[PDB]
């Protein structure tokens, strides 16, 4: 039986952050990837 092979989801990770001396909170962007695949 023929099966298709596809590399599983991968991407870059970017950190969105204001200045350190405004706040320490950051957000994370996973490029070209579902939110479901993140964990």
């Amino acid at each position: 039986e023929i099966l298709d092979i596809t590399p599983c989801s991968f991407g870059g990770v970017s950190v969105i952050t204001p200045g350190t001396n405004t706040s320490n909170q950051v957000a994370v962007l996973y490029q070209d990837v579902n939110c479901t695949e993140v964990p």
Binding site: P7, G11, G12, Q31, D32
Partner: peptide, 22 residues
């Protein structure tokens, strides 16, 4: 008229076509 993996990644443009049209 204009119509046309292994680490390759295509980043989306900051301005979409709709915003450029606007």
């Amino acid at each position: 008229k204009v119509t046309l993996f292994n680490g390759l990644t295509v980043l989306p443009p900051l301005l979409t076509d709709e915003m450029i049209a606007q």
